[PDB]
Amino acid sequence: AAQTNAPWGLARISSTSPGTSTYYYDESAGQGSCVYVIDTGIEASHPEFEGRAQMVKTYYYSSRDGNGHGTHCAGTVGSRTYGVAKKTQLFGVKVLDDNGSGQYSTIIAGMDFVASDKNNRNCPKGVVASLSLGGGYSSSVNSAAARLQSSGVMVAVAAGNNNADARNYSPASEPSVCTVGASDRYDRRSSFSNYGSVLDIFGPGTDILSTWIGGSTRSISGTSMATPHVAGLAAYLMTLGKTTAASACRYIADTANKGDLSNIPFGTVNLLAYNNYQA
Ligand SMILES: [Ca+2]
Ligand SMILES: [Ca+2]
Ligand SMILES: [Cl-]
Ligand SMILES: [Cl-]
Ligand SMILES: [Cl-]
């Protein structure tokens, strides 16, 4: 399949070279997989989600996304126009309040919630969790993300936006999950992206167009926006039978575009997620 005039990051993950604007993908499109977006919530009624999104859990007075961040991330996973995996099922877990903040104890509960809740849902091709959030190092937050991976969910997390080594942030620094840095449309490391040997992969992160609350759209930047490109790519490859939740991060790194990025520090991987679709 081909989507003309796609956002640049969708085009980039289906291309060997930068500067193109069509997104190529197998029409299966993640059907039969499930992606949990663990964030400020999701505006499920946005037309772009087509009834494929729903809120399953909140820790605040409401389950609605009053911020936008969680809706934008979910749109990059799975919206019809701006999403990688256009037929996947999206589940929202609201661990962050509408200012974008939340306690580590709440985020830990949300991760253990997903490891159980997947047994209540129909996801025969597999289950992914997208975590576009982070803070200072916490061994309890890292262990929670490791449990979720071990339970059989592909866990993708954002490296963080400090232009610093990600070893000092959680859950970015947890080695068993998939830690995602950000690149821009010119195949440079985004100037804010964290780096380090704990990174696994890069995805598009600067100037990313996706869904927003109030049924709108906008373009914003961060490792937050890179992470759901990889989450959606995982769900897409799992639906194709190429990989499993346990090995998807390794499979994405195996099959990535290699050596294409500039401004990569010595000792950080030079790998850019790629769906390897041969039309
Ligand atoms: Ca959410
Ligand atoms: Ca990692
Ligand atoms: Cl996310
Ligand atoms: Cl890793
Ligand atoms: Cl690369």
Side-chain angles (χ1 to χ4, degrees):
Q3 181 195 346
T4 192
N5 301 311
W8 78 262
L10 294 195
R12 188 76 192 75
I13 64 167
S14 63
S15 187
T16 47
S17 51
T20 68
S21 70
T22 306
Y23 174 44
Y24 308 106
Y25 60 99
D26 185 272
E27 223 219 306
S28 58
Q31 211 178 29
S33 70
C34 300
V35 185
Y36 287 79
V37 191
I38 300 173
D39 208 287
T40 57
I42 309 168
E43 186 171 279
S45 75
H46 196 303
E48 277 279 315
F49 295 118
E50 311 171 299
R52 290 177 295 97
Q54 63 191 83
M55 287 300 302
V56 295
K57 184 63 167 171
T58 180
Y59 294 91
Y60 303 88
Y61 59 87
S62 178
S63 76
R64 132 179 183 279
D65 182 15
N67 182 277
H69 185 265
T71 294
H72 196 281
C73 295
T76 296
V77 174
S79 74
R80 68 196 177 181
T81 307
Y82 314 100
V84 172
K86 301 187 187 293
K87 292 176 179 136
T88 192
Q89 173 75 33
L90 301 167
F91 301 111
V93 181
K94 180 166 181 57
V95 294
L96 298 175
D97 70 22
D98 293 329
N99 307 295
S101 333
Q103 285 293 331
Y104 266 163
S105 60
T106 299
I107 291 167
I108 288 170
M111 291 193 259
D112 282 327
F113 172 81
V114 178
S116 193
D117 183 76
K118 72 169 190 289
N119 298 306
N120 293 315
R121 315 288 167 197
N122 281 302
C123 315
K125 299 309 197 177
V127 191
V128 185
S130 190
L131 280 114
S132 289
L133 59 83
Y137 175 89
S138 171
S139 72
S140 277
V141 172
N142 278 18
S143 296
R147 293 197 294 282
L148 180 61
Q149 177 76 35
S150 167
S151 85
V153 177
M154 191 280 186
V155 177
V157 309
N161 307 314
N162 311 101
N163 185 32
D165 194 315
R167 78 196 325 151
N168 278 334
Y169 302 93
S170 293
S173 60
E174 164 56 35
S176 70
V177 302
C178 211
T179 302
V180 183
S183 61
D184 73 15
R185 71 168 73 247
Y186 299 111
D187 278 2
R188 310 182 288 242
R189 184 175 60 98
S190 305
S191 65
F192 53 80
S193 182
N194 283 357
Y195 54 83
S197 69
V198 79
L199 264 65
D200 299 290
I201 192 70
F202 283 83
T206 301
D207 287 341
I208 304 299
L209 175 70
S210 185
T211 47
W212 200 255
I213 56 169
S216 64
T217 57
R218 68 178 59 184
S219 180
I220 57 162
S221 296
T223 58
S224 276
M225 286 65 249
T227 299
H229 282 89
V230 172
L233 180 61
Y236 164 88
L237 295 165
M238 296 165 60
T239 285
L240 288 166
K242 305 283 198 178
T243 190
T244 72
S247 55
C249 193
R250 189 183 301 215
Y251 182 86
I252 290 167
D254 284 352
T255 56
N257 288 133
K258 309 159 172 67
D260 288 354
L261 298 175
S262 60
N263 197 26
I264 301 294
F266 193 88
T268 294
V269 292
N270 193 329
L271 305 169
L272 184 67
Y274 174 51
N275 77 354
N276 223 87
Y277 183 68
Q278 314 299 332

PDB file of all heavy atoms in Angstrom, residues 213-236:
ATOM      1  N   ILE A 213      -6.218  17.205  20.850  1.00  0.00           N
ATOM      2  CA  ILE A 213      -7.566  17.249  21.415  1.00  0.00           C
ATOM      3  C   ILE A 213      -8.382  18.363  20.761  1.00  0.00           C
ATOM      4  O   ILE A 213      -7.853  19.277  20.109  1.00  0.00           O
ATOM      5  CB  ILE A 213      -7.482  17.432  22.939  1.00  0.00           C
ATOM      6  CG1 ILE A 213      -6.669  18.690  23.264  1.00  0.00           C
ATOM      7  CG2 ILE A 213      -6.888  16.186  23.535  1.00  0.00           C
ATOM      8  CD1 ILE A 213      -6.744  19.103  24.720  1.00  0.00           C
ATOM      9  N   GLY A 214      -9.697  18.284  20.967  1.00  0.00           N
ATOM     10  CA  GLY A 214     -10.637  19.120  20.239  1.00  0.00           C
ATOM     11  C   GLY A 214     -10.762  18.740  18.774  1.00  0.00           C
ATOM     12  O   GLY A 214     -11.103  19.588  17.953  1.00  0.00           O
ATOM     13  N   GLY A 215     -10.450  17.493  18.422  1.00  0.00           N
ATOM     14  CA  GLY A 215     -10.572  17.055  17.035  1.00  0.00           C
ATOM     15  C   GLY A 215      -9.657  17.757  16.059  1.00  0.00           C
ATOM     16  O   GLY A 215      -9.978  17.844  14.869  1.00  0.00           O
ATOM     17  N   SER A 216      -8.505  18.247  16.532  1.00  0.00           N
ATOM     18  CA  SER A 216      -7.569  19.038  15.753  1.00  0.00           C
ATOM     19  C   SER A 216      -6.290  18.234  15.478  1.00  0.00           C
ATOM     20  O   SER A 216      -6.238  17.014  15.699  1.00  0.00           O
ATOM     21  CB  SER A 216      -7.250  20.352  16.487  1.00  0.00           C
ATOM     22  OG  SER A 216      -6.581  20.109  17.731  1.00  0.00           O
ATOM     23  N   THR A 217      -5.254  18.942  15.014  1.00  0.00           N
ATOM     24  CA  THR A 217      -3.941  18.380  14.717  1.00  0.00           C
ATOM     25  C   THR A 217      -2.882  19.433  15.067  1.00  0.00           C
ATOM     26  O   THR A 217      -3.177  20.628  15.071  1.00  0.00           O
ATOM     27  CB  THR A 217      -3.765  18.041  13.236  1.00  0.00           C
ATOM     28  OG1 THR A 217      -3.998  19.246  12.471  1.00  0.00           O
ATOM     29  CG2 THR A 217      -4.682  16.926  12.773  1.00  0.00           C
ATOM     30  N   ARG A 218      -1.644  19.002  15.356  1.00  0.00           N
ATOM     31  CA  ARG A 218      -0.535  19.948  15.413  1.00  0.00           C
ATOM     32  C   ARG A 218       0.793  19.200  15.359  1.00  0.00           C
ATOM     33  O   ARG A 218       0.847  17.989  15.526  1.00  0.00           O
ATOM     34  CB  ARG A 218      -0.589  20.831  16.659  1.00  0.00           C
ATOM     35  CG  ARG A 218      -0.334  20.091  17.952  1.00  0.00           C
ATOM     36  CD  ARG A 218      -0.353  21.090  19.168  1.00  0.00           C
ATOM     37  NE  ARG A 218      -1.630  21.793  19.285  1.00  0.00           N
ATOM     38  CZ  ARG A 218      -1.897  22.757  20.178  1.00  0.00           C
ATOM     39  NH1 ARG A 218      -0.971  23.140  21.034  1.00  0.00           N
ATOM     40  NH2 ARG A 218      -3.106  23.329  20.210  1.00  0.00           N
ATOM     41  N   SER A 219       1.872  19.952  15.159  1.00  0.00           N
ATOM     42  CA  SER A 219       3.221  19.390  15.023  1.00  0.00           C
ATOM     43  C   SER A 219       4.066  19.798  16.228  1.00  0.00           C
ATOM     44  O   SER A 219       4.160  20.989  16.545  1.00  0.00           O
ATOM     45  CB  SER A 219       3.854  19.875  13.712  1.00  0.00           C
ATOM     46  OG  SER A 219       5.159  19.378  13.508  1.00  0.00           O
ATOM     47  N   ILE A 220       4.637  18.810  16.924  1.00  0.00           N
ATOM     48  CA  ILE A 220       5.487  19.049  18.089  1.00  0.00           C
ATOM     49  C   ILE A 220       6.670  18.083  18.032  1.00  0.00           C
ATOM     50  O   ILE A 220       6.722  17.193  17.186  1.00  0.00           O
ATOM     51  CB  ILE A 220       4.731  18.918  19.435  1.00  0.00           C
ATOM     52  CG1 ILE A 220       4.091  17.553  19.579  1.00  0.00           C
ATOM     53  CG2 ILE A 220       3.650  19.991  19.561  1.00  0.00           C
ATOM     54  CD1 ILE A 220       3.712  17.210  21.006  1.00  0.00           C
ATOM     55  N   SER A 221       7.648  18.288  18.949  1.00  0.00           N
ATOM     56  CA  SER A 221       8.960  17.634  18.883  1.00  0.00           C
ATOM     57  C   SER A 221       9.339  17.020  20.229  1.00  0.00           C
ATOM     58  O   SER A 221       9.052  17.602  21.275  1.00  0.00           O
ATOM     59  CB  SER A 221      10.060  18.665  18.489  1.00  0.00           C
ATOM     60  OG  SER A 221       9.888  19.203  17.193  1.00  0.00           O
ATOM     61  N   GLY A 222      10.010  15.867  20.188  1.00  0.00           N
ATOM     62  CA  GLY A 222      10.558  15.229  21.371  1.00  0.00           C
ATOM     63  C   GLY A 222      10.818  13.747  21.183  1.00  0.00           C
ATOM     64  O   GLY A 222      10.349  13.139  20.238  1.00  0.00           O
ATOM     65  N   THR A 223      11.581  13.177  22.135  1.00  0.00           N
ATOM     66  CA  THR A 223      11.700  11.711  22.091  1.00  0.00           C
ATOM     67  C   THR A 223      10.351  11.040  22.359  1.00  0.00           C
ATOM     68  O   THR A 223      10.169   9.871  21.994  1.00  0.00           O
ATOM     69  CB  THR A 223      12.761  11.181  23.068  1.00  0.00           C
ATOM     70  OG1 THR A 223      12.466  11.582  24.410  1.00  0.00           O
ATOM     71  CG2 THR A 223      14.152  11.675  22.679  1.00  0.00           C
ATOM     72  N   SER A 224       9.414  11.787  22.979  1.00  0.00           N
ATOM     73  CA  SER A 224       8.010  11.406  23.101  1.00  0.00           C
ATOM     74  C   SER A 224       7.351  11.030  21.774  1.00  0.00           C
ATOM     75  O   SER A 224       6.466  10.161  21.744  1.00  0.00           O
ATOM     76  CB  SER A 224       7.233  12.579  23.738  1.00  0.00           C
ATOM     77  OG  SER A 224       7.307  12.585  25.155  1.00  0.00           O
ATOM     78  N   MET A 225       7.698  11.734  20.693  1.00  0.00           N
ATOM     79  CA  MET A 225       7.131  11.528  19.356  1.00  0.00           C
ATOM     80  C   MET A 225       7.858  10.442  18.571  1.00  0.00           C
ATOM     81  O   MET A 225       7.257   9.755  17.714  1.00  0.00           O
ATOM     82  CB  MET A 225       7.229  12.826  18.535  1.00  0.00           C
ATOM     83  CG  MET A 225       6.268  13.959  18.899  1.00  0.00           C
ATOM     84  SD  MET A 225       6.490  14.678  20.537  1.00  0.00           S
ATOM     85  CE  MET A 225       4.948  14.031  21.258  1.00  0.00           C
ATOM     86  N   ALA A 226       9.151  10.283  18.841  1.00  0.00           N
ATOM     87  CA  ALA A 226       9.911   9.175  18.296  1.00  0.00           C
ATOM     88  C   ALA A 226       9.427   7.827  18.831  1.00  0.00           C
ATOM     89  O   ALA A 226       9.315   6.852  18.060  1.00  0.00           O
ATOM     90  CB  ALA A 226      11.400   9.393  18.607  1.00  0.00           C
ATOM     91  N   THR A 227       9.109   7.742  20.129  1.00  0.00           N
ATOM     92  CA  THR A 227       8.784   6.444  20.731  1.00  0.00           C
ATOM     93  C   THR A 227       7.617   5.760  20.041  1.00  0.00           C
ATOM     94  O   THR A 227       7.696   4.542  19.785  1.00  0.00           O
ATOM     95  CB  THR A 227       8.492   6.659  22.226  1.00  0.00           C
ATOM     96  OG1 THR A 227       9.657   7.208  22.862  1.00  0.00           O
ATOM     97  CG2 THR A 227       8.143   5.395  22.951  1.00  0.00           C
ATOM     98  N   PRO A 228       6.504   6.437  19.765  1.00  0.00           N
ATOM     99  CA  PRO A 228       5.374   5.744  19.155  1.00  0.00           C
ATOM    100  C   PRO A 228       5.580   5.362  17.707  1.00  0.00           C
ATOM    101  O   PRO A 228       4.804   4.531  17.225  1.00  0.00           O
ATOM    102  CB  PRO A 228       4.202   6.734  19.315  1.00  0.00           C
ATOM    103  CG  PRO A 228       4.825   8.050  19.605  1.00  0.00           C
ATOM    104  CD  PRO A 228       6.150   7.781  20.273  1.00  0.00           C
ATOM    105  N   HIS A 229       6.556   5.940  16.980  1.00  0.00           N
ATOM    106  CA  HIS A 229       6.900   5.395  15.670  1.00  0.00           C
ATOM    107  C   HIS A 229       7.382   3.949  15.822  1.00  0.00           C
ATOM    108  O   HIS A 229       7.014   3.066  15.031  1.00  0.00           O
ATOM    109  CB  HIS A 229       7.992   6.216  14.977  1.00  0.00           C
ATOM    110  CG  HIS A 229       7.511   7.488  14.360  1.00  0.00           C
ATOM    111  ND1 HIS A 229       7.461   8.679  15.059  1.00  0.00           N
ATOM    112  CD2 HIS A 229       7.069   7.763  13.111  1.00  0.00           C
ATOM    113  CE1 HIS A 229       6.997   9.631  14.273  1.00  0.00           C
ATOM    114  NE2 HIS A 229       6.745   9.106  13.085  1.00  0.00           N
ATOM    115  N   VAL A 230       8.195   3.699  16.852  1.00  0.00           N
ATOM    116  CA  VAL A 230       8.743   2.374  17.088  1.00  0.00           C
ATOM    117  C   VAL A 230       7.674   1.437  17.652  1.00  0.00           C
ATOM    118  O   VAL A 230       7.572   0.286  17.243  1.00  0.00           O
ATOM    119  CB  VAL A 230       9.946   2.458  18.044  1.00  0.00           C
ATOM    120  CG1 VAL A 230      10.395   1.056  18.456  1.00  0.00           C
ATOM    121  CG2 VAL A 230      11.081   3.221  17.390  1.00  0.00           C
ATOM    122  N   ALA A 231       6.895   1.913  18.629  1.00  0.00           N
ATOM    123  CA  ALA A 231       5.751   1.147  19.120  1.00  0.00           C
ATOM    124  C   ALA A 231       4.858   0.691  17.967  1.00  0.00           C
ATOM    125  O   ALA A 231       4.520  -0.485  17.850  1.00  0.00           O
ATOM    126  CB  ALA A 231       4.960   1.988  20.123  1.00  0.00           C
ATOM    127  N   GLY A 232       4.474   1.618  17.093  1.00  0.00           N
ATOM    128  CA  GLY A 232       3.626   1.224  15.986  1.00  0.00           C
ATOM    129  C   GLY A 232       4.340   0.296  15.019  1.00  0.00           C
ATOM    130  O   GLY A 232       3.735  -0.644  14.494  1.00  0.00           O
ATOM    131  N   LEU A 233       5.630   0.531  14.780  1.00  0.00           N
ATOM    132  CA  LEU A 233       6.386  -0.353  13.906  1.00  0.00           C
ATOM    133  C   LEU A 233       6.431  -1.772  14.491  1.00  0.00           C
ATOM    134  O   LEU A 233       6.247  -2.751  13.759  1.00  0.00           O
ATOM    135  CB  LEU A 233       7.792   0.188  13.696  1.00  0.00           C
ATOM    136  CG  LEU A 233       8.691  -0.663  12.797  1.00  0.00           C
ATOM    137  CD1 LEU A 233       8.104  -0.775  11.406  1.00  0.00           C
ATOM    138  CD2 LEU A 233      10.077  -0.067  12.748  1.00  0.00           C
ATOM    139  N   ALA A 234       6.620  -1.893  15.820  1.00  0.00           N
ATOM    140  CA  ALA A 234       6.588  -3.203  16.470  1.00  0.00           C
ATOM    141  C   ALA A 234       5.276  -3.927  16.202  1.00  0.00           C
ATOM    142  O   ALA A 234       5.272  -5.118  15.861  1.00  0.00           O
ATOM    143  CB  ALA A 234       6.799  -3.056  17.975  1.00  0.00           C
ATOM    144  N   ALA A 235       4.143  -3.236  16.427  1.00  0.00           N
ATOM    145  CA  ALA A 235       2.834  -3.856  16.257  1.00  0.00           C
ATOM    146  C   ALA A 235       2.635  -4.309  14.812  1.00  0.00           C
ATOM    147  O   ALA A 235       2.111  -5.397  14.554  1.00  0.00           O
ATOM    148  CB  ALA A 235       1.741  -2.875  16.684  1.00  0.00           C
ATOM    149  N   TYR A 236       3.115  -3.510  13.872  1.00  0.00           N
ATOM    150  CA  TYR A 236       3.022  -3.812  12.449  1.00  0.00           C
ATOM    151  C   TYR A 236       3.813  -5.067  12.107  1.00  0.00           C
ATOM    152  O   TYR A 236       3.296  -5.933  11.404  1.00  0.00           O
ATOM    153  CB  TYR A 236       3.519  -2.575  11.664  1.00  0.00           C
ATOM    154  CG  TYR A 236       3.854  -2.797  10.212  1.00  0.00           C
ATOM    155  CD1 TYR A 236       2.867  -2.687   9.240  1.00  0.00           C
ATOM    156  CD2 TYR A 236       5.130  -3.119   9.801  1.00  0.00           C
ATOM    157  CE1 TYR A 236       3.131  -2.903   7.914  1.00  0.00           C
ATOM    158  CE2 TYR A 236       5.403  -3.355   8.437  1.00  0.00           C
ATOM    159  CZ  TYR A 236       4.403  -3.223   7.510  1.00  0.00           C
ATOM    160  OH  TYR A 236       4.662  -3.436   6.173  1.00  0.00           O
TER     161      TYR A 236
END
